[PDB]
Amino acid sequence: KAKEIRDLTTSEIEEQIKSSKEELFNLRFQLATGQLEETARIRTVRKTIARLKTVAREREIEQSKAN
RNA sequence: UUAAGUUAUUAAGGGCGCACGGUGGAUGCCUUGGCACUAGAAGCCGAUGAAGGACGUUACUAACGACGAUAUGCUUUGGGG
Name the amino acid, one letter, at A60.
E
Helices A12-32 and A41-66, axial angle in degrees (round to 10): 160
d(CA A61, CA A67): 10
| Cα-based angle A57, A43, A24 (whole degrees, multiple of 5) | 80
Report CA(A50)–C1'(B20) in Å, whole number: 74
Q: How far is CA A26 from the centre of its chain?
A: 15
**Between the CA of residue A8 and those of A12, A15, A52, A53, A57, what are the distances in Å?**
6, 11, 10, 13, 14
Structure solved using which method?
cryo-EM
Protein side of the strand B interface (CB < 7 A): A 1-3, 31, 39-40, 42-43, 46-47, 49-51, 53-54, 57-58
d(CA A5, CA A57): 13
Would you kindly state where each structural domain of chain A is located, as residue ranges? Answer: 1-67
In what helix (H) or strand (E) does residue A66 lie, and over which residues does it extend?
A: helix A41-66
d(CA A62, CA A7): 15
Q: Resolution limit in angstroms?
A: 2.3
